[PDB]
Design an enzyme around this catalytic site. Sequence first.
Site, PDB file in Angstrom:
ATOM      1  N   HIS A  41       0.825  -1.235   0.000  1.00 47.42           N
ATOM      2  CA  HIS A  41       0.000   0.000   0.000  1.00 47.42           C
ATOM      3  C   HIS A  41       0.849   1.271   0.000  1.00 47.42           C
ATOM      4  O   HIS A  41       0.272   2.378  -0.137  1.00 47.42           O
ATOM      5  CB  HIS A  41      -0.984  -0.033   1.177  1.00 47.42           C
ATOM      6  CG  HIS A  41      -0.434   0.168   2.562  1.00 47.42           C
ATOM      7  ND1 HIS A  41      -0.243  -0.890   3.434  1.00 47.42           N
ATOM      8  CD2 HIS A  41      -0.012   1.254   3.235  1.00 47.42           C
ATOM      9  CE1 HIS A  41       0.188  -0.432   4.593  1.00 47.42           C
ATOM     10  NE2 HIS A  41       0.319   0.874   4.493  1.00 47.42           N
ATOM     11  N   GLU A  72       0.771  -8.494   0.880  1.00 47.91           N
ATOM     12  CA  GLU A  72       0.924  -7.076   1.337  1.00 47.91           C
ATOM     13  C   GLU A  72       2.400  -6.688   1.495  1.00 47.91           C
ATOM     14  O   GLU A  72       2.646  -5.659   2.131  1.00 47.91           O
ATOM     15  CB  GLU A  72       0.172  -6.802   2.640  1.00 47.91           C
ATOM     16  CG  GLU A  72      -0.103  -5.313   2.882  1.00 47.91           C
ATOM     17  CD  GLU A  72      -0.720  -4.492   1.777  1.00 47.91           C
ATOM     18  OE1 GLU A  72      -1.498  -5.058   0.983  1.00 47.91           O
ATOM     19  OE2 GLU A  72      -0.453  -3.244   1.758  1.00 47.91           O
ATOM     20  N   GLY A 146       1.704   6.068  10.510  1.00 50.94           N
ATOM     21  CA  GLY A 146       3.137   6.358  10.709  1.00 50.94           C
ATOM     22  C   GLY A 146       3.945   5.099  11.050  1.00 50.94           C
ATOM     23  O   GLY A 146       5.129   5.130  10.799  1.00 50.94           O
ATOM     24  N   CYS A 148       3.523   1.944   9.679  1.00 45.01           N
ATOM     25  CA  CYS A 148       3.523   0.932   8.578  1.00 45.01           C
ATOM     26  C   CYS A 148       4.937   0.786   7.994  1.00 45.01           C
ATOM     27  O   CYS A 148       5.662   1.836   7.819  1.00 45.01           O
ATOM     28  CB  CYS A 148       2.468   1.209   7.516  1.00 45.01           C
ATOM     29  SG  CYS A 148       0.793   0.845   8.128  1.00 45.01           S
TER      30      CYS A 148
HETATM   31  C1  U3C Z   1      -5.787   4.706  -0.479  1.00 39.23           C
HETATM   32  C2  U3C Z   1      -5.993   3.323  -1.004  1.00 39.23           C
HETATM   33  C3  U3C Z   1      -6.119   3.066  -2.367  1.00 39.23           C
HETATM   34  C4  U3C Z   1      -6.343   1.769  -2.789  1.00 39.23           C
HETATM   35  C5  U3C Z   1      -6.434   0.755  -1.856  1.00 39.23           C
HETATM   36  C6  U3C Z   1      -6.254   1.093  -0.522  1.00 39.23           C
HETATM   37  N1  U3C Z   1      -5.991   0.164   0.485  1.00 39.23           N
HETATM   38  C7  U3C Z   1      -6.077  -1.184   0.449  1.00 39.23           C
HETATM   39  O1  U3C Z   1      -6.458  -1.874  -0.494  1.00 39.23           O
HETATM   40  C8  U3C Z   1      -5.571  -1.820   1.695  1.00 39.23           C
HETATM   41  C9  U3C Z   1      -5.940  -3.268   1.915  1.00 39.23           C
HETATM   42  C10 U3C Z   1      -4.589  -3.905   2.134  1.00 39.23           C
HETATM   43  C11 U3C Z   1      -3.761  -2.786   2.786  1.00 39.23           C
HETATM   44  N2  U3C Z   1      -4.270  -1.497   2.276  1.00 39.23           N
HETATM   45  N3  U3C Z   1      -6.066   2.343  -0.093  1.00 39.23           N
END
Ligand code: U3C
Length: 182
Positions: A41, A72, A146, A148
């Site tokens: 992300h 991830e 902060g 991550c």
């Molecule tokens: C701002 C943004 C854009 C697109 C996707 C997301 N977030 C996610 O998909 C997640 C799930 C796994 C960890 N972050 N957040």
Amino acid sequence: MGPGFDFAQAIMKKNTVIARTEKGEFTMLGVYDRVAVIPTHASVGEIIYINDVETRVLDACALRDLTDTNLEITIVKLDRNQKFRDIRHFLPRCEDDYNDAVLSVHTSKFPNMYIPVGQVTNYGFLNLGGTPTHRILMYNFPTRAGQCGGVVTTTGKVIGIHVGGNGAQGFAAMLLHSYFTD
Ligand SMILES: Cc1cccc(NC(=O)[C@H]2CCCN2)n1
């Protein structure tokens, strides 16, 4: 303050950089050569800032398991003039639970931060921000934005990187030795 923090500090002081993307500053762990990890992300592109130095990204892969499920972790090769100490021998070979972990973060905002998070659970599947995610580690600490990319260590092992939380609990993506076979 103790051996847990001693191992954490030893990783932080040689094997992290501050990574900046358009999504923010991240703790980035360097594993070997010019190869580093960051949460997916962070949205790594073709250029990333590494300790505020403009850096071409030579390659990047958002990892998924063989079930084609999100892990991830993004693995990044950096066009940098300097190699990381090789710490692949600190990575576990298998999925596991742990005791007495530390979560360590280093950004412009949170420099030199160490959190004793305690017991780490092999949680497995998590719906992480609406993404089905495998190989999640869970600890009972109230982690905040902060953190991550924060590194999760025991004495002797680098076990994961922080990727999220729910206010009460934190969630790390596992690091496994098989991710970095050269
Ligand atoms: C701002 C943004 C854009 C697109 C996707 C997301 N977030 C996610 O998909 C997640 C799930 C796994 C960890 N972050 N957040």
